[model samples]
Target: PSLLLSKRIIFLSSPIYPHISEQIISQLLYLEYESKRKPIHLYINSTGDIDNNKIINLNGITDVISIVDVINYISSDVYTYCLGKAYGIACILASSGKKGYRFSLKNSSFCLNQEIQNKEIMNTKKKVIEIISKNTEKDTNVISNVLERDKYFNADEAVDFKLIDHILEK
Candidate 1:
């Protein structure tokens, strides 16, 4: 279990699938609100792959809305940095960063899409779409399409999508 003893920056280096986990959510919440108001970096390095049936190896859908929801309600600023690979819901998480503070390393790769593979969470997926739509320029239609097919973006193109506010150069 994680502790709040010295929680500061929001950091994660594992697949967001299965769930972001309650431990992560609890600590992140404490850090964002109770910590210094000064804007700090949030690091995310997640990896997941969909098979031929569009099943993601790590299903982070449960925490999809949870992460975005907390971000919206937080008073302190969160600057998201895509450290390496952010795919599926993690992609949404990375790009959902505050408008002016989102950044991606030049070598980092990102993917944005929905998770229809898990029919059990159909409503949750729709809600996730809503969160993504509210946070980004993407519309419901576009989100649906991207869900139908994995959509990847290079750093430059992400800037156009408003996903990457800045691309950190090597």
Candidate 2:
């Protein structure tokens, strides 16, 4: 099958912190090299005032699509995101219905640090879910008809809330 015709979709990374963009780009490079067929897309969201030059650089090497574009274009067997802060939320929303996408939200050191309060994190999560539910019209069992406190970033959370159809990884 032609690379464009295949059903598999791969998500590179949605790096929010500016410092981690290099690492994200490296991983994306590896994936792009290894996956000879099918389409690969990267999900990106605004974090503070930081600019994303990594994506621009990657676009130079391969085709890149926004999360919204990916949701509309690609059908894949697996999807995943390192869910954190705003970018994480955007990824989950974008890749909401694919059967094999995993939205992984690692407890970030920044989130885990005692300097930051848990309430703020909860608030951010709530805000993310709200934004996703509002924008998407897809019939997602993952998040359709639920209040804010009920949802988390877990695959079950993603699936039950219609954020995604399946969890490829925890």
Candidate 3:
């Protein structure tokens, strides 16, 4: 991990729970200081279940905000790529990379989780909608509406939705 950190290459292959988000944020901060704002390659494969179920690996939207805040705080350009799948907040993180640098494999899966309209969840949902709107340059209402139901996209559709910039051709 330290070796990869030294190289400014981060692989997010698991869930973005508290501890993992901590590690990712720490690595970003460390690299910011050590590398003086060079580009950081973030390869992500975080998903729910390998069996193609709706079970995602994200803890909550808080961890999503946690890592995103640091990613925006740092001067480095975080280039994110989807390796296999990116669901829920993982989808957000994948798209939160520097604009024009976000990408995914040709067959990567991109899905959004359904959000509840309860008080607590709604507040979090608002934050998520804002983040998605900002990342995709879509209106808040549009994002909110789209997020009302669970959505899925292929690499090309992800590009159309602005979740990713391009599909990896190689």
Q: Pick the candidate with the highest TM-score.
A: 3
In the range 70-159, model 3's lDDT, one tens digit per residue, is 899888899999999898878988999999999899999998876354777767767888888999999998887887798999999999
Q: Give the distance in Å from residue 13's predicted Cα in candidate 1 to where it truly belongs.
A: 1.0
* Structural similarity to truth (TM-score) of each candidate: 0.78, 0.33, 0.88
Model 3, poorest ten-residue lDDT window? 48-57
The per-model lDDT (C-alpha) reads 0.71, 0.37, 0.84
For candidate 2, give the lDDT.
0.37
Query: Which candidate gets the maximum lDDT versus the true structure?
Result: 3
Q: Using TM-score, rank the candidates from best to worst.
A: 3, 1, 2
| Cα deviation of 153, candidate 3, in Å | 0.6
Higher lDDT: candidate 1 or 2? Answer: 1
94 Cα displacement, candidate 2 (Å): 8.4
TM-score of 2: 0.33
Task: Write model 2 residue lDDT over 5-73, tens digit each, in one string.
Answer: 232333333333433444444444444455644444433232222235333232211121233333444
Candidate 1 lDDT over residue span 60-106, tens digit each: 66666676777777777778998887777777788777888999888
Estimate the Cα RMSD of every predicted model relative to the unseen true structure: 4.2, 11.6, 3.2
